[PDB]
Scaffold this active site. Structure first.
Site, PDB file in Angstrom:
ATOM      1  N   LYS A   4      -7.751 -29.272  74.071  1.00 20.12           N
ATOM      2  CA  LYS A   4      -8.524 -28.614  73.127  1.00 20.12           C
ATOM      3  C   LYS A   4      -8.352 -27.073  72.627  1.00 20.12           C
ATOM      4  O   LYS A   4      -8.608 -26.706  71.722  1.00 20.12           O
ATOM      5  CB  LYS A   4     -10.136 -28.413  73.678  1.00 20.12           C
ATOM      6  N   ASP A  47      -8.738 -35.337  67.332  1.00 16.86           N
ATOM      7  CA  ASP A  47      -9.694 -36.068  68.470  1.00 16.86           C
ATOM      8  C   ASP A  47     -10.368 -35.209  69.339  1.00 16.86           C
ATOM      9  O   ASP A  47     -10.262 -33.930  69.605  1.00 16.86           O
ATOM     10  CB  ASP A  47      -8.682 -36.937  69.288  1.00 16.86           C
ATOM     11  N   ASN A  48     -11.825 -35.689  69.707  1.00 21.85           N
ATOM     12  CA  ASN A  48     -12.404 -34.916  70.993  1.00 21.85           C
ATOM     13  C   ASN A  48     -13.054 -33.750  70.472  1.00 21.85           C
ATOM     14  O   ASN A  48     -13.251 -32.916  71.237  1.00 21.85           O
ATOM     15  CB  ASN A  48     -11.411 -34.662  72.197  1.00 21.85           C
ATOM     16  N   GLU A 101     -13.907 -42.591  74.351  1.00 23.79           N
ATOM     17  CA  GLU A 101     -13.251 -43.690  74.741  1.00 23.79           C
ATOM     18  C   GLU A 101     -13.785 -44.062  76.038  1.00 23.79           C
ATOM     19  O   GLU A 101     -13.884 -43.624  76.964  1.00 23.79           O
ATOM     20  CB  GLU A 101     -11.725 -43.588  75.029  1.00 23.79           C
ATOM     21  N   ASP A 115      -4.402 -34.130  69.585  1.00 21.22           N
ATOM     22  CA  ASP A 115      -5.072 -34.817  70.700  1.00 21.22           C
ATOM     23  C   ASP A 115      -4.355 -34.537  71.838  1.00 21.22           C
ATOM     24  O   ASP A 115      -4.227 -35.350  72.784  1.00 21.22           O
ATOM     25  CB  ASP A 115      -5.109 -36.417  70.544  1.00 21.22           C
TER      26      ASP A 115
HETATM   27  N1  LIG Z   1       0.908 -27.965  74.619  1.00 18.22           N
HETATM   28  C1  LIG Z   1       0.994 -29.268  74.874  1.00 18.22           C
HETATM   29  N2  LIG Z   1       2.005 -29.986  74.004  1.00 18.22           N
HETATM   30  C2  LIG Z   1       2.352 -31.285  74.090  1.00 18.22           C
HETATM   31  N3  LIG Z   1       1.624 -32.220  74.996  1.00 18.22           N
HETATM   32  C3  LIG Z   1       0.464 -31.698  75.544  1.00 18.22           C
HETATM   33  C4  LIG Z   1       0.315 -30.199  75.755  1.00 18.22           C
HETATM   34  N4  LIG Z   1      -1.011 -30.028  76.449  1.00 18.22           N
HETATM   35  C5  LIG Z   1      -1.346 -31.240  76.898  1.00 18.22           C
HETATM   36  N5  LIG Z   1      -0.418 -32.074  76.530  1.00 18.22           N
HETATM   37  C6  LIG Z   1      -0.442 -33.575  76.590  1.00 18.22           C
HETATM   38  O1  LIG Z   1      -1.462 -34.158  75.612  1.00 18.22           O
HETATM   39  C7  LIG Z   1      -1.748 -35.325  76.308  1.00 18.22           C
HETATM   40  C8  LIG Z   1      -3.368 -35.676  76.251  1.00 18.22           C
HETATM   41  S1  LIG Z   1      -4.063 -37.197  76.319  1.00 18.22           S
HETATM   42  C9  LIG Z   1      -3.107 -37.973  74.689  1.00 18.22           C
HETATM   43  C10 LIG Z   1      -3.817 -39.294  74.443  1.00 18.22           C
HETATM   44  C11 LIG Z   1      -3.056 -40.018  73.425  1.00 18.22           C
HETATM   45  N6  LIG Z   1      -3.029 -39.338  72.025  1.00 18.22           N
HETATM   46  C12 LIG Z   1      -3.794 -41.478  73.014  1.00 18.22           C
HETATM   47  O2  LIG Z   1      -4.863 -41.365  72.303  1.00 18.22           O
HETATM   48  O3  LIG Z   1      -3.274 -42.490  73.451  1.00 18.22           O
HETATM   49  C13 LIG Z   1      -1.477 -35.441  77.806  1.00 18.22           C
HETATM   50  O4  LIG Z   1      -0.556 -36.491  78.184  1.00 18.22           O
HETATM   51  C14 LIG Z   1      -0.711 -34.219  78.014  1.00 18.22           C
HETATM   52  O5  LIG Z   1       0.103 -33.861  79.059  1.00 18.22           O
HETATM   53  O1  LIG Z   2      -7.517 -33.373  77.753  1.00 19.68           O
HETATM   54  C1  LIG Z   2      -7.602 -34.222  76.718  1.00 19.68           C
HETATM   55  N1  LIG Z   2      -6.718 -34.361  75.780  1.00 19.68           N
HETATM   56  C2  LIG Z   2      -6.687 -35.559  74.899  1.00 19.68           C
HETATM   57  N2  LIG Z   2      -7.562 -36.214  74.487  1.00 19.68           N
HETATM   58  C3  LIG Z   2      -8.597 -36.218  75.760  1.00 19.68           C
HETATM   59  C4  LIG Z   2      -9.685 -37.093  75.620  1.00 19.68           C
HETATM   60  O2  LIG Z   2      -9.595 -38.009  74.498  1.00 19.68           O
HETATM   61  C5  LIG Z   2     -10.610 -37.120  76.527  1.00 19.68           C
HETATM   62  F1  LIG Z   2     -11.698 -38.053  76.508  1.00 19.68           F
HETATM   63  C6  LIG Z   2     -10.696 -35.962  77.608  1.00 19.68           C
HETATM   64  C7  LIG Z   2     -11.777 -35.940  78.450  1.00 19.68           C
HETATM   65  C8  LIG Z   2     -11.635 -35.888  79.809  1.00 19.68           C
HETATM   66  C9  LIG Z   2     -12.703 -35.783  80.793  1.00 19.68           C
HETATM   67  C10 LIG Z   2     -13.818 -36.087  80.241  1.00 19.68           C
HETATM   68  F2  LIG Z   2     -15.031 -36.282  81.403  1.00 19.68           F
HETATM   69  C11 LIG Z   2     -14.269 -36.255  78.964  1.00 19.68           C
HETATM   70  C12 LIG Z   2     -13.055 -36.327  77.930  1.00 19.68           C
HETATM   71  C13 LIG Z   2      -9.835 -35.271  77.796  1.00 19.68           C
HETATM   72  C14 LIG Z   2      -8.622 -35.412  76.662  1.00 19.68           C
HETATM   73 CL   LIG Z   3     -13.501 -47.487  73.153  1.00 18.24          CL
HETATM   74 MG   LIG Z   4      -8.306 -37.610  73.123  1.00 15.80          MG
END
Ligand SMILES: Nc1ncnc2c1ncn2[C@@H]1O[C@H](CSCC[C@H](N)C(=O)O)[C@@H](O)[C@H]1O
Ligand SMILES: O=c1[nH]cnc2c(O)c(F)c(-c3ccc(F)cc3)cc12
Ligand SMILES: [Cl-]
Ligand SMILES: [Mg+2]
Length: 213
Positions: A142, A167-168, A197, A139
């Protein structure tokens, strides 16, 4: 202040210390009523809870911590002595996550590691004493899902039955990863359709169970 600081302060002022459920509810309330944020959220979180309960993993790796929502979500369902490692590249978010976990009373179950997944994964065995992982929550970003899956395998961190939960896979979408795991005899895959979400937008999780080389 940042959105992430505002989420943490909201939890601090609207949840109960030591009560994970109150923390998740506060975050979800803030993010529904005030400011959207990329927490996995309640809809997809319920699917994650069902998976965690099915497998009772002893060691979980999370890629991407953000504010700690998913870490709280998973860690509150871990059995005594089970552990979560979470990797977070952004140091401000790593600090928010740590404080979130401390507030929830989950800090003894979680290690929040500040760095890039692609740099930290190769250190898990020697530096962090890991043998193999029981579960991985992908997560982070992508474009790293496929490369980090293949790195996990190269590093000997997967075993027969390791559960990858991504996720996603729909929004933003991870087409390379999905095509790969769904086409590979090394994974058994299932898709769990849900919603982005806090939004009326379809998203989903992919479960890909590693089956050995
Ligand atoms: N290569 C990488 N290694 C570690 N963290 C990364 C990364 N690329 C992006 N991130 C981190 O991944 C996060 C994505 S959002 C994570 C949401 C969390 N899992 C939840 O559901 O509460 C961001 O905080 C971002 O800084
Ligand atoms: O980059 C991400 N890392 C991890 N989780 C994500 C996520 O749950 C998102 F919904 C989205 C997201 C951001 C913008 C949107 F318009 C839609 C989804 C991005 C991330
Ligand atoms: Cl939700
Ligand atoms: Mg996510």
């Amino acid at each position: 202040d940042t959105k992430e600081q505002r989420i943490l302060r909201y939890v601090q002022q609207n949840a109960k210390p030591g009560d994970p459920q109150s923390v998740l509810e506060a975050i979800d309330t803030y993010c529904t009523q005030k400011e959207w944020a990329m927490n996995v959220g309640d809809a997809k979180g319920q699917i994650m809870d069902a998976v965690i309960r099915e497998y009772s993993p002893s060691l979980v790796l999370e890629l991407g911590a953000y504010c700690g929502y998913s870490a709280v979500r998973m860690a509150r369902l871990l059995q005594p002595g089970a552990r979560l490692l979470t990797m977070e590249i952004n140091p401000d978010c790593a600090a928010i996550t740590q404080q979130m976990l401390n507030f929830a009373g989950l800090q003894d179950k979680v290690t929040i590691l500040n760095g890039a997944s692609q740099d930290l994964i190769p250190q898990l065995k020697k530096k962090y004493d890991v043998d193999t992982l029981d579960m991985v929550f992908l997560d982070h970003w992508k474009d790293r899902y496929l490369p980090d899956t293949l790195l996990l395998e190269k590093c000997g961190l997967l075993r027969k039955g390791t559960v990858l939960l991504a996720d996603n896979v729909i929004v933003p979408g991870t087409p390379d990863f999905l095509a790969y795991v769904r086409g590979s005899s090394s994974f058994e895959c299932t898709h769990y359709s849900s919603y982005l979400e806090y939004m009326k937008v379809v998203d989903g999780l992919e479960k890909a169970i590693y089956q050995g080389p």
